[PDB]
C-alpha cells in the first residue's frame, strides 16, 4: 500500500458563512484506489498558497509511503528543513494529510477510525453552538437570550457567545467598563432564559492581559459559566495559569495551539482544564489522541474546536467518540446547510447530540463535485483581528 | 509463640444492606490457642477469590511467625514477588491479617490495642452517619432525615448529592448537580443550625476545575468537609481544590500505606485523612499515618463502609489519637459481634476488653454466607 | 463482534530458568472465532490464583464486549470495586486481556498491531541481555567481562548486570564499601572488555536510599553506563529525581509501575529519562503507547522491560516498533530455547537486533500444545526479595 | 512615505555550497524610489513557493504602509488569520520584509540601522568559522584546519563531531559519539592553545540526560559553548543541562519572536542566544531579544547559515549590542553584494553606509537562478 | 557628529503648582549646531545642585561623543565610578541627557523619535488627570 | 542635644595611592561642642559635588536634630523627595553623616560605638590586604604575585587578595578568555605553593562575568581552596549570582556595590552570597550594617567589611566587626601605615596580621583636620573606574 496522488480543494463558504470564509480540503489516493479526505485549518496565508503547500509537502514527504506509518510521516514533515518546533503553517497542512491517512487506514480495515484508537466510548456526543441570528444577537444581551432559548428548544444544552469586545493585533488589552457591563449582562439574561437547561460558554478571543481577564472573571463567576475560553494570548501558558488559579470558572484553550509539546505546557502549568484542539491544526488524529491522554493525567477534558469545514468536524467526532474525557463538541448550528451538501451523507444531529457514523474511517465522504462547484473567489483570509488598538 | 491456622468467613449482609453487600472476615489462631479476628476491604475481585487470596498470603508470609513481629510480617507481604509499592488488592488482604495480629498481641498482653499505641486519649468518639431512609434526591426530605438524626444525638451527618459517579471521572458538574448540591446544604443547615456539622460526601466525581465550581456554592454553609472532590491518582491536583476553598478537603478511602498519605500531607491535598483500616495497611500503619498528620495540621476521620471488625480497629486508632476528628457510623452489625458496640448520643464508647475489644461470633458469621 | 470465552495457561519455565519460574498466558476467543493471545505479569499471589483473577475480570467487564472497545474495557476494569487507583494485581490481569484484544483487533484488520498504533518506525529493534553463566558471573568482575565479551561477539550492543548486592524487604539501604568496590570493578572490567562496542546497563533493584544511590553513582560515572536502573524504591518519584539531577548517568525505572498516572509523575518530577514498561503490568498496549507519547514531551525514551514469557515479549516488540522514542529492548538471551518452542514461529533475533513480525496482531501465536505440556509444579513466586 | 513594490530572487549557491543550496532575497521599494533589501529563511518548503508567500504577506500587510511603522507591520502579520503565536514559516518571511524596511529607514536618514537602534558600540566584530578520514570525523584532521584558522586570525572555531542527527531526536550519544567528541576537543585544544575558543556545535541530537553524559566529558577543554544540546520544544528541559555543566549552553537558531526567547532566558535554558535574523522576527525584534538577555547575564551570538543579507542584518544588531559575544562568519558572498563585507584578522568590520550598509547586486542574483 | 555644549534651566512652577514645585531642563548642542532638549526628574537633592550634576556627567561622559551612540553613553554613565547598579540620582540625570540625544537624533533624521523606535501605532493617546479644585 | 555644624574635606591621596584617588571626610559639630567624624564612599559624581551634596543633606535633615535619633534621621534622608529605594549616591552621603553621629553618640556615652551596638566580641580582627607592587608586574605575573604574597605572609597577614581575571568593562558581564582562565589558575596555583596553609586566597574579581562565565572560571579555581569568589557577576540580579554560588564549592562574597538592609536581605535570601562585603561608607551607616550583619546570622553568612577608600570608613568597619559574632576578615590597605596614619590623631593599631580595636570613644580615633586641609585633591578623575 502506497499513497500516490493528492487533489486539493479550496471551497468558498456561502451565506450566511457560519464557520468562516473558506474551507481547505485534501483528497489522498493510494495506488490501488482507496481514497482519504482531510481538511487543513490555517490562515497565515491565502488558501491558494496553503493548498500548494499541502501539495509540496505530499510530494516531499508522503508519495510512496504506507499511510499506516503515521509516526514516520509526521516526523518526516515536522523535521523537514531542520525545524522540529511547533509551527501552525506546517502543522495545519500536516493535520490535513494525517486525517486522510486515518480515513484510508480505517477504510482499509473496514472500521471507523475511533475503533482503531481505543474504541467507541460514546453513543452520542454532547453538542454546542455559537448563538447566531444597529442592535443584534452579538451586542444586545436580551436578543442573545432569546437566541439561546431557541437553541435550548432545539435541544442544545450549551451555547457560546463572545460579548467581550473586539480582539486586536495589539492584544492583550484591558476590558472597558462597557465591555464588563455587556459581558455580565449577557451572562445574567442568558442564564435567566435557560436556567439549568444549558451551560453558558464564554467564548473570548484572547482579548485580555492577565489582570484584565481577572477583572472580568470576577464579574462572571455568579452565573456559573462552564468556561472562560482563551482569556489571554497563546504565547505564554504560564501567564494563563494565573487567570485559571484565580477563578472558579474553568479556563478553556487550544484553538491556536499545535503539537503535543504545546499542550504539554498548558497542562503542566495548569493554564487550562479544558483543551480545545482543532484537528485541522493540532497535528492530526493520533496527536490529538496523544494530547487527550495527557489531559487524563491532569484532571482535564477535551472540547474539540471547530470554525471551519465538515471534515475537521469529522476528525473531531472521531476523537470525541473514543475519548473518556470528552466534554462537549462544537457545532456549526445543527450541521445542516452547506455542511450537509459537502458530505455524501450528512453529520447526524439529534436533540443536542452528534451521533457518530459507524462507516469506515472518518465515517463520511467528501462530495467532491459539490466541492469543485464552489470555488473560493474572495481575497480575504478565513479569520482576522481588529487592526486599531482596543477601545479607547 | 507462633501463628498456625487461618479460617475465612465470607458473609452476606442482610437488608437494608447498609455498608455493602458482603463482608470478608479472617480468624488467626496461634500455637498455644490465642485467637485474632480481622476484616479485609477488597472489591476489585469476587469475595470468594479474596478469601483464597488471604489464605495464600497467610501461608506464604504469616504462618509459623510471631504476630508481635508486625514490621517483619508487613514488609514480607508488601515485598512479596518483588513489588514493594502500594497496591490495594494486597494491602486490603494485609490490613485484615495485621488487624488480627493486634487482636492477638493485645489479648496476649491483657490490654486493648489502643493502650499499646500511645494509650487512651478519648473516653468518647464523636460519631457521624449517612442520611438513610426521596432522601438521596430531595433536599427537604434529607433536611428531615437530618433533624431526626440530631434527635438521636448525632453531631454530624453526611450526604452525596453531587450526581452520578462514572468510570470516566473526573467530570464537570451539571447546573442541576450544582443546584441540588447547594439546595441540600441550605435546607439541612436550616434544619440543624449549629447543632450538627455538614459532611459533603462526594465520590471522586469531578475534575479539579469542576470541584472548584461546586466548592464556591457550598462555602457559605460552613461544611465541615468536602470529601474526595476529584479522583485519587494525583494528590498534586487535589491540592488546588484544597487551596481555593475554605471548606476542608477530606480524602483517602481509596488510598493505602504511609507512602500515599505522606504525599497527600506534603502537597496540601487534604487536611482530613480517611483511612479504612481494612485497606490502609493495618492498625500499626494507620497510627504512623496519624502521626504524620500531626505534622501538617491534619486530622483523622476513619472510613467505614464494610463490617463491624474494620470498625472495631477504626475505634482502636481513634481512641489513642490526639488528632481524631470524627468516626463513621451506621442492627446486624451488633449481631456478628459477641458484645455489641456501645453508642450513646452521637458518641461511641471504646471497649476495654483486650485487643480489638470485641470478638466475632463465628456461629452467626457462618450462618450467613454470601 | 463480541468476546466469548477465555482460557488460562500456567506455564513452568524449564532450566536454566532465565526469565523467571513460571508464565501466565491468556487466550481470548470471539463469538465468530478470532483468537487473541496474551500474558499477565504478577507475582503478588501464586499463578494458579492470578489465573482465577483473569477469569473473574474477563467475566464481569470483558465477556460480550467488542474487543475494539479498549477504553471502555479498561475503564470498566480500572474502576471496579470503587477503586480507580493504580494497583499491580488488577493492572496485571488487565494487561494480558488487553494485549489479547489487540491481537484480535489486528487479526481482524489484517494488520500488525503497530500499524494501527502509529505505524512502523524501526525496521529493527536494538536489544540487550543480562550476563548469564553457561565465584561466578553474578559476583566476579572478570567472569562478567568474559560473558560480556561473548555477548558482543554474538551481536549484542548492550549488556545488563546488578553487582550492587542483595535487595531486601527493608530497602532502601546503604551500599557496603564492598558493594561500591565490586560495583565499580564490574564497570571497569566490562568496559575494558567491550570497549565502545557495547553500552553498560547497570541494573540495580531498588536497593538504596537517595543518599545511598549518590554514593554509588559517583563511582560509576567514569565508565559511561547508559543507565542506572531503579536506584531507589518506587513509592516517591520526587526522591528518585534527586538522584537523577545529581548524576550524569541516566536513571531508568518502571518495571514496578502501572498506569499512565504513575509515569506522569515520573516524567514531571524528572525521576527518569528512560521509562521501562513491562506490558504484562503497565496496563496494556494502548496504555503503554500513551505513556511513550508523554515521555516524548519530556526528553524521555522507552526501553520495555522483560522478565517473563514470550507474549509480554511480543507486545513489548509491538510497542517498540511504532515508538519514535524507543531506546532498547530487553531480551532473554536470543529468544532461543523455550521462548522459541512456545511460539508457532519464533521471535526473529539477528545480530543484536529483534526483527518485528509482519503477521497481524501481536505477530505470532502461542503454541497451546506446548503450553499445556508444561505446567508449573512448584510452590514459589516469580521473583522475590531478601529478609 | 509608503511602500510600493516587492521583487523576489531565488539565487542558487554554486559549489562548495557553504551556506545552503539557494538564497531567498527580497526587494522593497517606496513610491518615491528608496530601495531596501532583505533575506528570508525558509527550508520548510520550496523557493518559488516561499517567494510567493513573501509577495502574499507584502500585499496583505505591507503595501501602502509607512516602512517606519515596524510595530504596526509586525503585528498586522503576526496576527493575520487569527494566529498571533510564534511560527517560523511566517516569522521567516516577516524577517526578510522587516530588514528591508530597516534598510529603507536607514537610507532615509543617511545612517546605518545600528545608529538608530542604540548606536555603534563595537568598531570590530569577533568572528568564528566552521572547520572545512576528514575534518568532520577525524580529530587530528580537525586540529590542522583549526590551526590554519588561528593562523588566519580567527579566535574561535566550531565543529560538530557529536553524531548524525535523526528525525526522531532526541536520542542518546553512542560510546563512539562520546569518544570522538572528546578527541575533537582534546586534539584541537592542543593545536590552538589559548588562541581560539572551542564552539561545540551539536544539532539538538540528544535528550537531557544524553547531553549531560556528553557535557561531562567536555568540561576539561573549556569549550566556549555547548550549542543546541537538545530539541527546541521544552526550554525548561534544556535548563536542566545548563545547570549541570560548567559549559555555557547556546541555543536559538530554531526559535522566533520575543516570546520564545523570553522563556529561554527565564528558565535559564541558555546563556548565549543564537538568533538568525532571517527567521527570528527582524532587526527590531532581535534588539528587544538582546536587551532581554542583558537582564539575564546572557549574551548574543547571531547564527548564520544562509546568504549575505542575513549576515548584514546580523552585523547590524551585533555592532550596536553591549552583550555581543561572537559572530558567525564564512567568495560568492562578495559577488552578491555591491561592496564586500569587510574581514580582517579575525574580525568583521561594520560598514558605515546607510541601512544595512551594503546593497544586493540585483544583476548577479538574476543571473544565478536556482535549479 | 559630536556633542559640544550643555545648558541647564531650573524653572519654578507657578500657581496652582500642579506638577511639583520646579522643573529641571537641559539643552544639548552639537558642534554643527543641532539643539536637543530634555528634563531631569530628580529630587533627592536641591535643583541648583542636580543641575550641576548634569553638567558633571556631560563633561565626563557626553562631550565629544556621537549622540546616536546611546548604548555607549548610557554605559559610560551607568558604570562611571565603578557602580553599574540602579541609582535614582544618576539615572534621573542620564534620562534627561538621553532624551535630548533622542531629540537630536530625530532632528537630524527629520523624523519623530517614535518613527525610529518602531513607528507610530497610535494616532491618539488616551489621557488621565488627577482630581484638582 | 542638637547638631549644628558640618565641615567637608575633599582630601587627595598621596602616592602610591593605595585605596584610590581621594577621600571625602565629614566633621559634624553639636552645639555644646562634641565633634563627630565620618567618611562618604561615593564616585558617581566628582568629590567636590559630593561634598556639596553632604551639606545639602545635613542642612535638610540633620540640623537641629539629636544625633541619637538615627532611625528618624536615616528615614528622613532615605525618603527625601519621595524616593525611598536604594541609591548609592544618597546612601553614601547618609553613611558618612551617620558614622559621625555614632562618633558623637559614643563620645557622649564615653564608650566606643561598639560597646553600644552589642559590645566587644573580638580582641583582634583578622586582616587581609590586596597584593600591591612598589610589562611584567604583580597584576599579570603569577610568580611576581607569589613573591608579593610571600612577603605579605612574612608580616603576619593570613589572607591576600588578587584579581587576575582580566579587565572589567562598562559592558559586563562577559566571558573569560582562555588566557583569563589560564592566568587565574596560575595565580591561585603559584600563590598557594608560596604560602601553603599559612594564608587564605581571596579571589577578588570585580563583576566581570556572566553567570556561565563565572562557572567556567569557578571550575578551575576550586582546587586551591579559595576562601572567596568576590563579585563573580554584576550587582543588579542576585537571583543570578545565586546560580554561581550553588554550582561551585568556593564561597561567593559580594556587596561593595550594594546598600541598605533591603539589598542584602535579597542577597541572603536568594543565596547569592555567604560572605557580605559592606563598605560602611556606602551601606547606609553603622546601625544599618549592624541590622545587616544580624540578618546574615540567620542565613549562615558572615561579614567581611570592604575598604578601598579613606581611614575613616576603616574605623567604621572596625567598629562593626568588633561587635559581630559572624565576623570573618577585615580589609586593610597595607598595614594601615602612611597617609592612613598621618590622617589620624592616633594611627590604627596593626600587629601581626590583626587589627586591635581602639577603646577610645566613638569611632575610636579622631581625624587630623590640619593634615586633611593641607591635602586637597587637584585632579579631575573619579576614585575607581571601568574599561570601555
Ligand atoms: Mg473560539
Ligand atoms: Mg465514601
Ligand atoms: Mg530489573
Ligand atoms: Mg548549528
Ligand atoms: Mg573589591
PDB file of C-alpha atoms in Angstrom, chain B residues 183-277:
ATOM      1  CA  UNK B 183     -30.047  23.208  47.920  1.00  0.00           C
ATOM      2  CA  UNK B 184     -29.145  20.217  50.104  1.00  0.00           C
ATOM      3  CA  UNK B 185     -26.706  22.327  52.145  1.00  0.00           C
ATOM      4  CA  UNK B 186     -29.069  25.292  52.554  1.00  0.00           C
ATOM      5  CA  UNK B 187     -32.052  23.216  53.691  1.00  0.00           C
ATOM      6  CA  UNK B 188     -30.102  20.939  56.032  1.00  0.00           C
ATOM      7  CA  UNK B 189     -28.180  23.779  57.709  1.00  0.00           C
ATOM      8  CA  UNK B 190     -31.674  25.227  58.153  1.00  0.00           C
ATOM      9  CA  UNK B 191     -32.920  22.075  59.895  1.00  0.00           C
ATOM     10  CA  UNK B 192     -29.971  21.568  62.233  1.00  0.00           C
ATOM     11  CA  UNK B 193     -28.499  25.005  62.932  1.00  0.00           C
ATOM     12  CA  UNK B 194     -25.276  24.943  64.941  1.00  0.00           C
ATOM     13  CA  UNK B 195     -26.107  21.522  66.417  1.00  0.00           C
ATOM     14  CA  UNK B 196     -24.664  19.413  63.585  1.00  0.00           C
ATOM     15  CA  UNK B 197     -21.779  19.673  61.098  1.00  0.00           C
ATOM     16  CA  UNK B 198     -22.362  19.047  57.352  1.00  0.00           C
ATOM     17  CA  UNK B 199     -20.212  16.389  55.658  1.00  0.00           C
ATOM     18  CA  UNK B 200     -20.401  16.779  51.849  1.00  0.00           C
ATOM     19  CA  UNK B 201     -19.512  13.245  50.860  1.00  0.00           C
ATOM     20  CA  UNK B 202     -18.549  13.137  47.167  1.00  0.00           C
ATOM     21  CA  UNK B 203     -17.124  10.093  45.338  1.00  0.00           C
ATOM     22  CA  UNK B 204     -14.236  11.485  43.252  1.00  0.00           C
ATOM     23  CA  UNK B 205     -16.688  12.649  40.543  1.00  0.00           C
ATOM     24  CA  UNK B 206     -15.044  15.815  39.372  1.00  0.00           C
ATOM     25  CA  UNK B 207     -12.069  17.378  37.714  1.00  0.00           C
ATOM     26  CA  UNK B 208     -10.174  19.989  39.709  1.00  0.00           C
ATOM     27  CA  UNK B 209     -11.976  22.829  37.897  1.00  0.00           C
ATOM     28  CA  UNK B 210     -15.266  21.010  38.322  1.00  0.00           C
ATOM     29  CA  UNK B 211     -14.706  20.754  42.061  1.00  0.00           C
ATOM     30  CA  UNK B 212     -13.737  24.434  42.402  1.00  0.00           C
ATOM     31  CA  UNK B 213     -17.065  25.356  40.731  1.00  0.00           C
ATOM     32  CA  UNK B 214     -19.059  23.352  43.261  1.00  0.00           C
ATOM     33  CA  UNK B 215     -16.983  24.460  46.257  1.00  0.00           C
ATOM     34  CA  UNK B 216     -17.883  28.050  45.535  1.00  0.00           C
ATOM     35  CA  UNK B 217     -21.572  27.321  46.083  1.00  0.00           C
ATOM     36  CA  UNK B 218     -21.164  25.469  49.404  1.00  0.00           C
ATOM     37  CA  UNK B 219     -18.643  27.628  51.319  1.00  0.00           C
ATOM     38  CA  UNK B 220     -21.477  29.741  52.721  1.00  0.00           C
ATOM     39  CA  UNK B 221     -22.966  26.844  54.689  1.00  0.00           C
ATOM     40  CA  UNK B 222     -19.709  26.098  56.519  1.00  0.00           C
ATOM     41  CA  UNK B 223     -19.457  22.413  55.624  1.00  0.00           C
ATOM     42  CA  UNK B 224     -17.092  20.540  57.917  1.00  0.00           C
ATOM     43  CA  UNK B 225     -15.589  18.887  54.843  1.00  0.00           C
ATOM     44  CA  UNK B 226     -15.660  18.218  51.106  1.00  0.00           C
ATOM     45  CA  UNK B 227     -14.826  14.522  50.613  1.00  0.00           C
ATOM     46  CA  UNK B 228     -12.717  13.275  47.678  1.00  0.00           C
ATOM     47  CA  UNK B 229     -13.521  16.163  45.324  1.00  0.00           C
ATOM     48  CA  UNK B 230     -11.516  14.537  42.493  1.00  0.00           C
ATOM     49  CA  UNK B 231     -10.100  11.048  41.780  1.00  0.00           C
ATOM     50  CA  UNK B 232      -7.086   9.783  43.811  1.00  0.00           C
ATOM     51  CA  UNK B 233      -4.172   9.305  41.353  1.00  0.00           C
ATOM     52  CA  UNK B 234      -2.777  12.844  41.576  1.00  0.00           C
ATOM     53  CA  UNK B 235      -2.827  14.391  45.087  1.00  0.00           C
ATOM     54  CA  UNK B 236      -0.973  17.305  43.488  1.00  0.00           C
ATOM     55  CA  UNK B 237      -4.209  18.154  41.659  1.00  0.00           C
ATOM     56  CA  UNK B 238      -6.419  17.793  44.731  1.00  0.00           C
ATOM     57  CA  UNK B 239      -4.242  20.445  46.395  1.00  0.00           C
ATOM     58  CA  UNK B 240      -5.687  23.084  44.060  1.00  0.00           C
ATOM     59  CA  UNK B 241      -9.187  22.476  45.360  1.00  0.00           C
ATOM     60  CA  UNK B 242      -7.969  22.469  48.983  1.00  0.00           C
ATOM     61  CA  UNK B 243      -6.116  25.803  48.478  1.00  0.00           C
ATOM     62  CA  UNK B 244      -9.046  27.522  46.701  1.00  0.00           C
ATOM     63  CA  UNK B 245     -11.852  26.856  49.213  1.00  0.00           C
ATOM     64  CA  UNK B 246     -12.353  27.476  52.937  1.00  0.00           C
ATOM     65  CA  UNK B 247     -14.041  24.081  53.155  1.00  0.00           C
ATOM     66  CA  UNK B 248     -11.580  21.414  54.329  1.00  0.00           C
ATOM     67  CA  UNK B 249     -10.860  18.633  51.848  1.00  0.00           C
ATOM     68  CA  UNK B 250     -11.126  15.087  53.166  1.00  0.00           C
ATOM     69  CA  UNK B 251      -9.834  12.026  51.299  1.00  0.00           C
ATOM     70  CA  UNK B 252      -8.209   8.645  51.459  1.00  0.00           C
ATOM     71  CA  UNK B 253     -10.869   5.911  51.487  1.00  0.00           C
ATOM     72  CA  UNK B 254      -9.145   4.667  48.311  1.00  0.00           C
ATOM     73  CA  UNK B 255      -5.513   5.019  49.467  1.00  0.00           C
ATOM     74  CA  UNK B 256      -3.022   2.745  51.247  1.00  0.00           C
ATOM     75  CA  UNK B 257       0.373   2.743  53.004  1.00  0.00           C
ATOM     76  CA  UNK B 258       2.184   5.652  54.639  1.00  0.00           C
ATOM     77  CA  UNK B 259       3.569   6.495  51.221  1.00  0.00           C
ATOM     78  CA  UNK B 260       0.361   7.688  49.579  1.00  0.00           C
ATOM     79  CA  UNK B 261      -0.853   9.527  52.669  1.00  0.00           C
ATOM     80  CA  UNK B 262       2.547  11.126  53.049  1.00  0.00           C
ATOM     81  CA  UNK B 263       2.171  12.636  49.588  1.00  0.00           C
ATOM     82  CA  UNK B 264      -1.360  13.745  50.495  1.00  0.00           C
ATOM     83  CA  UNK B 265       0.028  15.594  53.522  1.00  0.00           C
ATOM     84  CA  UNK B 266       3.042  17.194  51.874  1.00  0.00           C
ATOM     85  CA  UNK B 267       1.284  18.505  48.762  1.00  0.00           C
ATOM     86  CA  UNK B 268      -1.507  20.015  50.836  1.00  0.00           C
ATOM     87  CA  UNK B 269      -4.181  17.841  49.238  1.00  0.00           C
ATOM     88  CA  UNK B 270      -6.317  17.288  52.335  1.00  0.00           C
ATOM     89  CA  UNK B 271      -6.457  18.276  55.995  1.00  0.00           C
ATOM     90  CA  UNK B 272      -8.717  15.341  56.974  1.00  0.00           C
ATOM     91  CA  UNK B 273      -7.480  11.793  56.378  1.00  0.00           C
ATOM     92  CA  UNK B 274      -9.919   8.955  55.960  1.00  0.00           C
ATOM     93  CA  UNK B 275      -8.159   5.639  56.452  1.00  0.00           C
ATOM     94  CA  UNK B 276     -10.110   2.428  56.128  1.00  0.00           C
ATOM     95  CA  UNK B 277      -8.187   0.033  58.351  1.00  0.00           C
TER      96      UNK B 277
END
